[PDB]
Ligand binder design. Structure first.
Ligand SMILES: Nc1ncnc2c1ncn2[C@@H]1O[C@H](COP(=O)(O)OP(=O)(O)O)[C@@H](O)[C@H]1O
Ligand SMILES: Nc1ncnc2c1ncn2[C@@H]1O[C@H](COP(=O)(O)OP(=O)(O)O)[C@@H](O)[C@H]1O
Ligand SMILES: [Zn+2]
Lengths: 399, 92, 97, 602, 242
């Protein structure tokens, strides 16, 4: 839509892009029945306007009826009448491919009944529609602009991008399940897996075993008239400052059935929304999809946990174990779900870790959070040479 | 109008006095003096060239430029520089 | 990217540095500046050009201006018995220019 | 009369010639193969040929222009059929295009005279509003008579619909699916901020364009334009605006990642003369810093760097950083700032910054929202402006921690992510880095620890493959050598003329090497030999066991410095356009890295 | 002053022009000085201004000066402030046929001549549409021989114009309308003067026809073409490549 111009107006378009904001559902009139209680008769009238079909049909300025041709009364059947839904939304580019430094080029889109409840902000888009444009601006009436560029659609497709709370949600076949039932019955598979996970890089096998069992995750059981009990699991690691951790983050990113990424420091929106909706459709206040909450069944990537102040450590306690947020801002006092799982990463204060010294005085955290995460694995880089003789080989073996 | 020039006639004195005081700096001082200053003295030289409006550099005004940067570095330092007061006056 | 009182005319004013890209820009009380208003003058005397990365607009200019300034020492008096950066709390990398 | 002028114009089409070659005739013959339906024109070329059109197109242009359009279409119609008779229904009017260089007049010196004439000018751009459409041909049916008709409009993208063909007034519907339209936009302008009064805010002006004169421009691009000071609507007053009839842009102002990738053919032969010289490396080292002295070893890294390295991908996604990361480190003087000033010049599409971000410059993506509709847009980034480029920094010391973090992540994976409230980002950096240091009080650091500059003792010896103490300890003659090396610059131009005569010999100027760089940066397909494998595994285990003792003595080593020379060697061989590698440059490899381990000791 | 001289020199469409611009100036002046004379659109404000300024100087002319509701109002207000041929026995005026002749943008002298013809010989008539039709047609064929000599696409357009300006689908009556006036007007000295001026002589020149008809073979029937014709036709095939 940075490119869709006057050229090929009426020619079917497919645009790839993003969602920004939407419009509230609105059932809407197709036919207004009016009843004659003098006999037991009905009288049915129906409407139409520009945007139901593309052919420029002869218009009908139709008006709400009160009387009959006889001049009798009339009554309504809000419930035998037939109405229909509608939505409009605005679409601009995928931000990945942007001419970074420039504004987007957003346009307007419209929908029908079947195809409205599938969208939201922070969603990747592909459509099949028509770049119609209708009106008579300045032509007939009087005095400068022209038409109201827009699209109508016949098909829409969302799908996955890295960093969005959404799956590509891959498929299987009879042969795939054949192969998996073959894969299952082989009595080493977790181990061979655990080395097959990031075959790029060697070692840390105990640790990639754990990434595996985390993305597998628990079961997240709930209670008969009770609160919920945790399924997800989270990992933490500290070590010497040039090992596989930060590369392992990006590794685990794409690997999963779902995944979203963080950089570390960030305030008022890590799992929040600020609860301010700019609405001119009305004067009302609703929420927008929150970030941590944008994970629901997946895993999250976090690093540089050390640089995070308490102001969010505090915020996380109900989120690691109790997995839910409820807040009390001036407008709202409602509840939302964050059934997530997490991976961390650390750097200690003194470069590396020494086992003559304790494993605890250099992490510099509460024992609370040490307990909060399920598991903590430590890593070292004290020097030998046979410890890296073959690592050199494997690296060169796989460049 | 005036973009007056400099003639490479006796300019290797630049190289001379620079290397001189760049050693004399360590002789009693803590911080150095660096080519930044040299480039600046040249800019001052052409500055005074534009000032006089002469056709190109004159030699006996580089004395002014370099004296300026000299007594610039003078006051910029400790009382320890009080020996630089006696050392780096020959370039006056 | 500033508004205007008249009819919301978006405009691009620049600091007075920008105005005298051939000439000169005076300043008083150089100290009394935050992060970014300092980084700007640093950029100026460094590569003599500005950059902007905001508001659907990207650009560099010519900032080949002559700089003048002033400031106030810590304690009124200069503290004769110390060097410069040790007395006044300025930073060096723009001080070198 | 008007047809006299039409012929005086149409003779200029096919009966004009200069440098003994037809110009516009075959230009059209090409444009029609392009399916362009427009051209380019100069108006300087019309003054000598004929004075019967100039003095009247000046003062009554709109009276004369659509005539030219129709003349053009007339020429098209013959040549279309003739070329169909040669080899191998709907031919609209062709937008005309032109330009000029006669003069430039500013917005300030306008008045309410010479209005509706044509004027020349300068300025700066803002707007990229929206593709607003207009009509060109639109069919009409009456709702009662069912009486079809048709309308077409020409230039003004005067009259309205017909008021009566009883049907009454407004009897007409506009059909769309057999109607035709075109695009325009609303484009702004404002003067040079350097040529303004001291006091007031500036004055801007709108303008409009059409089909193929659209979308040429993006803001910041300084442009000159020529147009018609038109009008539309206190006591009684109409708004001044302008109609475009000529635009000319600098070819490429601020560096566009959508750059040129299909180079000419004449340059290939000298490129490959320079491929096949054995002196390639030594020339590049002689020329990257011609007005600069010593530190040959430092200049010997940049060429390893700019050419990148082994873009290698594997079926998980764990790419390896195709480029390399570097860090100067040292004192005043010693050229640590001047190269960095230079490198943007030699660079095709890269960027320079100071630290902390610069004025109005996010050192990473500083996202915010839209002035209109209050919506989200990824705005900027000094780390994504330069996607597929180097980045130059000075004063790395005074970072902000939030500023340091993402950049600290780039140099090992080169991909930033932001996941604030609603927007979820994975924006690719894919960049190389040049650092620059502020040693605390300068030189005594060699007497001290590696660090003891700043409180990142970790990342220094970790995320860097080129770290050098860059100094000599005031040798009494190096001063004189560098001084006389450099004094000749300021006048006599002997340092410049030496480069002249050496480019006449075996050296290369700025842009030939620029294009060489661009070409090889995007062309090559390097790799290294299994034979070259062990050569440095041995070096690695030896340096390990070596400094094990000397560092166990109570005075860094990484897998990364192991993995680094893997790619530097490939770069220096890449220079020779090397799909393989041998020891020829692997020796230079550790010849140059050893500076790092010597610094590693101290 | 531009607009004043415009509307003042709009009357034709020695002392007159001068005294009348002065008159309109001081008239407009007097009319606008006081607060007494308002809601007078300048759309029309230099017309009975000009008529009374005609009334003032020396000689005045009621016709061709006023040439309407408020025309009278403002006058008093200021003056206190101070087919076609089956139709039998039709009637016409000076300006009715000035219109029907000025539709071809012909000059006014020819029109005055047809007017003189009429007002002397509009006496014994059946229908003047015929006479004036034929008249202005034989003005056109005589003055427009050049463009027609090179453009035979004209003679259809012209006859079609006057066929429907007088509302007929049949036209041979128009043919008679031409030849009968030509039978009538054939031999007057002014007609003669026009024929020597614009040089038709049946549409053909003198120095040709006399050799056409005295008895010659040197008579140039231009079946062949002239040299400049070919000199310029060659350019069309010069660029035949394209
Ligand atoms: N245990 C290991 N074995 C072999 N190679 C490794 C190992 N750990 C890291 N590497 C390699 O060294 C590189 C260094 O990156 P890494 O240390 O992961 O960054 P960070 O320290 O910030 O996490 C990786 O790209 C990887 O290919
Ligand atoms: N190694 C060098 N050889 C020649 N000239 C130099 C060298 N280093 C710096 N200069 C000159 O000295 C001036 C100071 O610049 P530079 O030293 O790069 O900045 P800084 O001193 O802030 O690092 C520049 O104008 C530059 O031309
Ligand atoms: Zn009709």
């Amino acid at each position: 839509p940075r490119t869709l111009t006057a050229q090929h107006l009426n020619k079917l378009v497919s645009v790839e892009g993003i969602v920004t904001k939407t419009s509230l559902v609105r059932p809407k009139l197709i036919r207004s029945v009016h009843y004659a209680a003098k006999t037991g008769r009905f009288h049915y009238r129906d409407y139409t306007d520009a945007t139901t079909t593309l052919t420029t049909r002869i218009p009908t300025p139709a008006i709400y009826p009160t009387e009959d041709t006889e001049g009798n009364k009339l009554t309504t059947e809000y419930g035998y009448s037939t109405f229909i839904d509608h939505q409009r939304i605005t679409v601009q580019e995928m931000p990945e491919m942007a001419p970074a430094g420039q504004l987007p080029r957003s346009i307007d889109v419209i929908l029908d009944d079947d195809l409205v409840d599938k969208t939201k902000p922070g969603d990747r888009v592909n459509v099949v529609g028509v770049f119609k444009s209708l009106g008579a601006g300045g032509m007939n009436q009087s005095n400068l602009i022209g038409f109201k560029t827009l699209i109508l659609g016949n098909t829409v497709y969302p799908l996955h991008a890295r960093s969005t709370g959404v799956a590509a949600r891959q498929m299987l076949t009879d042969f795939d399940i054949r192969n998996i039932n073959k894969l299952s019955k082989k009595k080493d598979i977790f181990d061979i897996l655990s080395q097959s996970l990031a075959p790029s890089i060697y070692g840390h096998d105990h640790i990639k075993k754990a990434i595996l069992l985390m993305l597998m995750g628990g079961v997240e059981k709930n209670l008969e008239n009770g609160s919920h009990l945790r399924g997800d699991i989270n990992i933490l690691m500290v070590g010497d400052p040039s090992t596989a951790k930060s590369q392992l983050l990006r590794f685990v990113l794409n690997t999963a059935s779902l995944a979203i990424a963080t950089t570390g420091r960030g305030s008022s929106g890590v799992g929040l929304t600020a609860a301010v909706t700019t609405d001119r459709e009305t004067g009302e206040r609703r929420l927008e999809a929150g970030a941590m909450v944008l994970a629901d069944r997946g895993v999250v990537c976090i690093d540089e946990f050390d640089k995070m102040t308490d102001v969010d450590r505090v915020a996380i306690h109900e989120v690691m174990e109790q997995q839910t947020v409820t807040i009390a801002k001036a407008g709202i006092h409602t509840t939302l779900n964050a059934r997530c799982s997490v991976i961390a990463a650390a750097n200690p204060v003194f470069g590396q870790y020494d086992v003559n010294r304790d494993p605890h005085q250099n992490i510099a955290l509460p024992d609370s959070l040490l307990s909060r995460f399920d598991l903590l694995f430590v890593v070292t880089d004290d020097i030998n040479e046979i410890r890296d003789r073959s690592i050199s080989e494997h690296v060169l073996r796989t460049h | 109008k005036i973009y007056p020039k400099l003639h490479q006639m006796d300019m290797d004195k630049v190289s001379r006095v620079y290397a001189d005081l760049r050693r004399e700096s360590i002789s009693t001082g803590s911080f150095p003096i660096t080519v930044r200053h040299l480039e600046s003295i040249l800019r001052i030289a052409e500055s005074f060239a534009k000032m006089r409006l002469s056709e190109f550099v004159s030699s006996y005004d580089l004395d002014r430029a370099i004296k300026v940067v000299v007594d610039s570095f003078v006051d910029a330092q400790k009382v320890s520089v009080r020996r630089q007061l006696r050392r780096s006056f020959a370039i006056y | 990217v500033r508004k205007d009182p008249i009819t919301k005319e978006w405009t691009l004013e620049g600091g007075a540095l920008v105005l005298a890209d051939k000439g000169v820009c005076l300043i008083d009380e150089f100290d009394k500046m935050n992060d970014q208003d300092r980084t700007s003058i640093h950029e100026a005397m460094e590569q003599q050009s500005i950059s902007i990365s905001k508001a659907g607009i990207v650009t560099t200019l010519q900032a080949r201006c002559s700089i003048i300034a002033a400031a106030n020492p810590n304690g009124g008096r200069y503290n004769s018995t110390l060097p410069l950066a040790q007395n006044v709390s300025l930073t060096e990398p723009i001080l070198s220019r | 009369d008007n047809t006299e002028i039409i012929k005086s114009f149409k003779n200029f089409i096919l009966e004009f010639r200069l440098d003994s070659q037809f110009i516009y005739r075959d230009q059209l013959r090409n444009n029609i193969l392009v399916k362009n339906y427009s051209l380019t024109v100069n108006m300087e070329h019309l003054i000598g040929y004929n004075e019967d059109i100039y003095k009247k197109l000046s003062d009554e242009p709109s009276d004369i222009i659509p005539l030219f359009e129709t003349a053009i279409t007339q020429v098209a119609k013959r040549i279309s059929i003739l070329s169909r008779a040669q080899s191998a229904n709907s031919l609209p009017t062709f937008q005309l295009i032109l330009n000029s260089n006669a003069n430039q007049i500013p917005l300030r010196d306008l008045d309410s005279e010479h209005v509706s004439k044509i004027v020349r000018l300068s300025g700066i751009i803002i707007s990229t509003s929206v593709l607003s459409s207009r009509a060109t041909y639109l069919s009409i049916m009456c709702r009662n008579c069912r009486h079809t008709t048709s309308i077409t409009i020409n230039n003004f993208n005067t009259v309205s619909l017909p008021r009566s063909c009883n049907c009454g007034p407004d009897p007409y519907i506009i059909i769309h699916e057999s109607s035709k339209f075109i695009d325009q936009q609303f484009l702004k302008l404002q003067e040079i901020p350097e040529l303004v009064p001291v006091g007031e805010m500036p004055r801007n002006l709108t303008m409009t364009c059409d089909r193929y004169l659209t979308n040429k421009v993006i803001p910041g691009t300084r442009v000159t334009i020529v147009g018609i000071y038109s009008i539309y609507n206190g006591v009684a007053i109409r708004t001044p605006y302008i109609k475009i009839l000529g635009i000319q842009s600098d070819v490429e102002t601020s560096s566009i990642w959508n750059s040129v990738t299909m180079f000419t053919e004449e340059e290939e032969e000298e490129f490959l003369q320079l491929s096949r010289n054995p002196k390639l490396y030594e020339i590049l080292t002689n020329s990257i810093a011609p007005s600069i002295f010593g530190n040959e070893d430092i200049k010997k890294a940049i060429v390893c760097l700019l050419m990148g390295g082994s873009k290698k991908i594997l079926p998980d996604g764990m790419r390896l950083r195709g480029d390399i990361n570097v860090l100067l480190l040292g004192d005043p003087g010693t050229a640590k700032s001047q190269l960095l000033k230079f490198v943007e010049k030699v660079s095709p599409i890269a960027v320079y910054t100071s630290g902390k971000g610069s004025s109005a410059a996010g050192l990473t993506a500083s996202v915010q929202r839209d002035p209109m509709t209050r919506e989200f847009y990824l705005e900027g980034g000094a780390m994504v402006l330069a996607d597929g480029g180097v980045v130059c920094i000075d004063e790395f010391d005074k970072m902000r921690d939030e500023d340091r973090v993402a950049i600290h992540e780039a140099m090992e994976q080169q991909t930033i992510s932001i996941a604030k409230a609603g927007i979820t980002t994975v924006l690719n950096s894919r960049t190389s880095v040049l650092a620059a240091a502020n040693p605390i009080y300068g030189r005594y650091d060699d007497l001290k620890s590696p660090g003891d500059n700043i409180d990142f003792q970790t990342t220094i010896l970790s995320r860097f493959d080129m770290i050098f103490i860059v100094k000599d300890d005031h040798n009494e003659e190096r001063d004189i050598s560098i001084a006389n090396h450099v004094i000749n610059i300021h006048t006599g131009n002997a340092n410049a003329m030496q480069n002249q005569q050496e480019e006449n010999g075996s050296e290369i100027s700025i842009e030939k090497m620029k294009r060489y760089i661009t070409y090889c940066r995007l062309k090559c397909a390097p790799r290294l030999s299994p034979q070259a494998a062990e050569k440095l595994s041995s070096n690695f285990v030896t340096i390990r066991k070596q400094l094990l003792i000397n560092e166990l003595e109570s005075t860094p080593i990484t897998i990364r410095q192991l993995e680094a020379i893997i790619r530097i060697t490939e770069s220096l061989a890449k220079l020779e356009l090397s799909p393989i590698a041998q020891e020829r440059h692997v020796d230079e490899a550790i010849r140059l890295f050893q500076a790092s381990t010597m610094d590693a000791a101290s | 002053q531009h607009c004043v001289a415009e509307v003042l020199r709009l009357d034709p469409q020695s002392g007159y022009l001068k005294k009348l611009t002065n008159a309109t100036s001081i008239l407009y002046n007097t009319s606008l000085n006081k607060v007494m004379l308002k809601q007078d659109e300048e759309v029309a404000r230099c017309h009975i201004c000009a008529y009374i300024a005609s009334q003032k100087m020396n000689e005045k002319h009621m016709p061709d000066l006023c040439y309407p509701k408020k025309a009278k109002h403002l006058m008093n207000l200021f003056r206190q402030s101070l087919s076609l041929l089956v139709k039998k026995y039709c009637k016409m005026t000076t300006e009715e046929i000035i219109r029907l002749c000025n539709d071809f943008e012909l000059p006014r002298e020819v029109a005055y001549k047809i007017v003189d013809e009429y007002n002397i010989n509009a006496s014994r008539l059946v229908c003047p549409w015929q006479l004036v039709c034929g008249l202005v047609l034989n003005c056109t064929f005589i003055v427009f021989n050049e463009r027609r000599r090179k453009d035979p696409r004209i003679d259809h357009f012209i006859v079609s114009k006057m066929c429907s300006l007088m509302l007929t689908s049949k036209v041979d009556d128009v043919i008679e309308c031409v030849k009968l006036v030509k039978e009538l007007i054939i031999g007057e000295k002014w007609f003669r003067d026009l024929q020597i001026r614009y040089d038709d002589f049946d549409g053909i020149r003198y120095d040709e026809i006399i050799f056409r008809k005295l008895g010659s073979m040197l008579q140039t029937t231009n079946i062949l073409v002239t040299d400049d014709q070919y000199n310029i036709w060659k350019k069309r095939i010069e660029m035949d490549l394209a």
